Structure formats: structure tokens, C-alpha cells
Amino acid sequence: RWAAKFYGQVTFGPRNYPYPSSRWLARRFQMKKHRIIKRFRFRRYKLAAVANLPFAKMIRVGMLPELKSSKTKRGDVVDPTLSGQLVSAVKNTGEKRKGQRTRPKSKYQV
Amino acid sequence: HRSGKARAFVFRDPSLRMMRAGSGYQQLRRMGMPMQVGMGWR
């Protein structure tokens, strides 16, 4: 998996605590994770890794001039060909074509 | 404390601690192992 299971150290109890995480602590970090994921959902985040590019550096696609949510912030500079293609990918991901494997859809994906 | 330094159950036998030190840096300098390539103390 790409994304992170947890945010911060969720198993912190005393040694030999006979569980990965106590209720209290896991609840705190579920709060943290919740706020982050909610931020990702509402700001309509998008990332991409491209073939034949440094991979760990991910283009911020949700920040591109077309797909940008904000009407104010200057988005980002990504090459015209690569940008066109990224836009076409994001666009053609949205809907289910018959014969393809069903993949989970959301409001925030578009 | 899952996140924190491992502690010994009991102490270490000091004698044994001195026995493991035979080949350490100081004893090496005294053996004359490292080459003297520079001016050194005046």
C-alpha cells in the first residue's frame, strides 16, 4: 500500500501491554487520521506518479490549473503534454464501463 | 514503554566489562597499532 496505515505512533502503551493499542490512544489518533483524511476529501486531492519519471516525487494533480479547487492560489507548472494526458486520465477514471472491473466512486473523485 | 530504550534486568558484571576491553582503542595506541602520519604533539 502507498498511503499510511497510521498517523503518529499508535501503539504506545507500557511494555508487554497485551494489545497493539489501548482504546484511549487509538481514539486520539483516529481523530488525527480523521481530520487529515477529511482535509484530503474536501480539497479534492489528486496525486500521480508517472512512468519514466522519478517516482517518489509525485506530481500534484489536484493543484493543476484546470483541476484546481481554489480560484486564487497559483496552481503548479506541469508540462503541457503531460498535463493534457493527466487531465484525460482523471477525467476517464470517473465512470464504470461495462466489462471493466468495478472500482469505488465518490463525489470528491471528480 | 514500547517507544523507549531497552533496559537491563540487572547490572553488568564490572569484571567482565573490563575483560571485554582488551582490544580497545587505548590498548591499541599503546601497542602502537596506528601509523603516525602527522606531526602529533609538539
Binding site: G8, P14, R15, N16, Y17, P18, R28, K32 | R7, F9
Partner: peptide, 24 residues
């Protein structure tokens, strides 16, 4: 997180595995 204890909670129990984890 919130960096401070909101609750002042002191449990007094000292289970032997929590303390000597070298032997249990």
C-alpha cells in the same frame, strides 16, 4: 496531538509484565 493530559488519571496497579519485560 494535544500534547497534554486532559484527564488526570493515575492507576495504581503495577502488573509484573509491564515492569520486568526482560523476564515475561
Amino acid at each position: 496531538l494535544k500534547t497534554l493530559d486532559v484527564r488526570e488519571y493515575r492507576p495504581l496497579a503495577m502488573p509484573i509484565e509491564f515492569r520486568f519485560y526482560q523476564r515475561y
